[PDB]
């Protein structure tokens, strides 16, 4: 009948990239339940979104009744940790086994056979991954992933796998007029980009230098800045200027975050199913 | 909780045995019949590439059984893989909500799961396990079958440091009120 | 008859509080020569003002011919280091002896007799100071200081002495509609202020806890944040979000900075002597 | 830089001597006379509360002199205080730009200023100093606009030794080119 605000369950929410993308698309968000452990990430989300996010702490403490009463959910998104997918413990040991939890809760949030209401879901992981692990993930999600690289809409390499049932996940990725496509577009004043794109930025500080420092300032080599990484990933400037965090902590948060333009591309079809502004 | 069915309406059970086989082990209680080579038990081991349509073509089913490998056999696969694949194929095998009929599942563990694995299994199977001892061997069981003594945990802990369908068939007893009793 | 943009020489410029105040007042700035040696402060000024600040380096390397060439100057402002004004070396040893440099350069920038063109100057120092040092500073500047506390316009105690010939330096300090007068107005979301004003914030981190931590978040004690200190001092938020600086470096920069509303109070009469937007 | 004045037009010089007095020392060259009520020399040691109008009330001056205390004198004041106060009172004593008259200044140091103090003094006085030595040992440094070979290690070790008074003998001859500008008493 009438479009209603979207209700979202986000697992491994990080710095609330999903809520930010949904709000920037103009979609009304009726409820955003986020499962997240890192206190700095929760602080970022809380401050930047003014308490519109209901945080529920660890994903493994979410119960079936929790999914029943917090719900119903229109969207179920998830982004498992990728530090185990050299001491890697694979999909089944360490923190890779968290993926199944997502799967678990996903089946708890699905509507029944008689319920034909709109319900969308998405799961993100890294491409660098055992082919057997990708096989098992495709098995448990009963579908195959799309591979999207942020380089077509951002100034950095970030190839990620996305499983889900969103409309047009395989449609071609085209850049927008506002997408800062080159590193120079993401730099502060008086700073020059050595390259046009930067290699995949992880949590460690060894992924900035390309290992040649990416920036030149006053003729001296220099690494990237927090606001520069924020522009690279598509976040608003000072999005992680929270909780007295230095360059290291904000880089840790942004190095595992989602590329905002990629999530925008994936969530754009949702505007034809829920209330907008 | 299911109602009990009159004895004349009881049917030959169909079972899905993952990993471990209990074919003749289940005939020993009368749920299967000897002679039917196209019988009522489907056994599979490499479930890595089995899709929901595979389970649906092998069905319908009335019991889904999964078991960890025997303790002492060095596992080629991680212990949680069995639990996760059991859960996957079980959800593949559950009847649709618009056709409620007697349906049971059971996952047994031969003390191959540690504390975190036990917690994961209890979260996914929505119940705490039940231990069965032997005076020495023991098993853990999650099941929706209505079961009919007292052992502490350090006994199992030190027994695992040392280095089994006998304890399992007693759990299959309350199923007799739902299916045929051959032999 | 018609005014022109103001030309400013700022000694010990810090994070360019003077330029920020002059721009916020709407005064057109034709030139802003800043002497500053801290690379972090220079970076803050450069990025936040897009290179409009001609940065010179050590104040003691500025020559008479430098004042002649970079000049003429309409405004000469200065803010000497106050770490030597327990191991204090006074006004004549350590960094206190930098004050005279200001004095020196001030008399280089003063117009000659008969050159009745408008020329204003100002020098700031801390009240905590040997009365002999205050006496000698009043001697060298040939005038007496006005004491202004930032608590009447900001949410913190900051009593400072101001020498100068600016119009109305002794007029009463009245707050504006936008002055965040209490600590609660300066905090982020989901954070509660224990007090309404905070004690004098220095560079060290032991001046935040009042030593009771000033903020409560989620029922736990917590220190102030970088954006919170920025709001306390009157700077725009994220003004010091530069150069990968953490909480410590940004707090060091803000703890010796000027109170923006105080400098606005002192610089407001300049709108009637120079061009405005 | 000034032009030399004809001898019949030369005047009795007026000097401002701070910290160290050269009154009886400057009479020896003929710039002062014994029978003078003002004395033409104004001497003052504690200049902490000296205002500009004080220097102005003390009559116009033609020479301003300041000196650091002798080396064998424990400084109660920091060594740079003398330099800064000399600069202040000198700027107080300069004639207005609308009256270009002969005017000279001189600051002398008895090796009480270290290297950073030397650089500060050379920055404020807009010139490098000149060293006057004493053979058989003392020495002085001089900054002055009067148009009047030893390495530094000698002075360094000499200053370290000479701790355990003020030599006007070395500064006296610097006042000689001022004779072409003021009266020369017998
Ligand atoms: N057991 C757990 N329960 C809930 N969240 C967890 C978790 N283990 C890790 N996480 C969180 O999951 C995040 C995965 S990084 C991905 C963040 C998010 N997809 C984004 O785009 O920003 C990490 O930041 C971590 O804090
Ligand atoms: N010798 C020197 N030459 C130039 N700048 C100096 C200096 N010594 C110290 N400084 C700078 O002077 C600053 C004084 S703190 C005052 C900063 C400024 N008044 C503000 O309100 O932001 C310090 O940040 C220091 O970096």
Residue numbers in the entry:
A (entry chain D), C (entry chain A): 570 to 654, 659 to 783, 787 to 853
B (entry chain C): 178 to 312, 318 to 330, 336 to 350, 360 to 379
D (entry chain B): 178 to 313, 318 to 329, 337 to 352, 358 to 379
From the paper:
The R823G mutant complex primarily maintained a well‐folded tetrameric assembly, but its DNA‐binding and MTase activities were hampered. To better understand the defects elicited by the R823G mutation, we co‐crystallized the DNMT3BΔ570(R823G)‐3L complex with 24‐bp DNA and S‐adenosylhomocysteine (SAH). Two cofactor SAH molecules were bound in the DNMT3B homodimer as expected, at the identical cofactor binding site as observed in the previously reported crystal structures of DNMT3B‐3L complexes (Cho et al., 2023; Lin et al., 2020). However, despite multiple cycles of protein structure refinement, we could not observe an electron density for the DNA molecule, indicating that the DNA molecule was either not present or was disordered in the crystals. The arginine‐to‐glycine substitution at residue 823 was confirmed by the absence of the side‐chain density in the Fourier omit maps of both protomers. However, the mutation of Arg823 to glycine abolished the hydrogen bond between Arg823 and Gln827, altering the side‐chain orientation of Gln827 and weakening its hydrogen bonding with Thr775 (the hydrogen bond distance increased from 3.9 to 4.2 Å). Upon comparison with the DNA‐bound DNMT3BΔ570‐3L complex, the hydrogen bond between Arg823 and Gln827 is lost in the R823G mutant structure, resulting in altering the side‐chain orientation of Gln827 and weakening its hydrogen bonding with Thr775 (the hydrogen bond distance increased from 3.4 to 4.2 Å) and Lys777 (the hydrogen bond distance increased from 2.6 to 3.2 Å). Lys777 is involved in making van der Waals interactions with the flanking guanine downstream of the CpG site in the WT structure (Lin et al., 2020), implying that the R823G mutation may affect the flanking sequence preference of DNMT3B. The TRD loop (residues 772–789) in the WT DNMT3B is partially disordered from residues 781–786, but becomes less disordered in the R823G mutant from 784 to 786. On the other hand, the catalytic loop (residues 648–662) responsible for flipping out the cytosine at the DNA minor groove is well ordered in the WT DNMT3B, but becomes disordered between 655 to 658 in the R823G mutant for unknown reason.
The structure of this hetero‐tetrameric DNMT3B‐3L complex reveals a homodimeric DNMT3B assembly (with each monomer interacting via what is termed the “RD interface”) in a linear arrangement of DNMT3L‐DNMT3B‐DNMT3B‐DNMT3L, with the inactive MTase domain of DNMT3L interacting with DNMT3B via the so‐called “FF interface”. Notably, two loops of the DNMT3B homodimer, the catalytic and target recognition domain (TRD) loops, are responsible for clamping CpG sites of the DNA minor and major grooves, respectively.
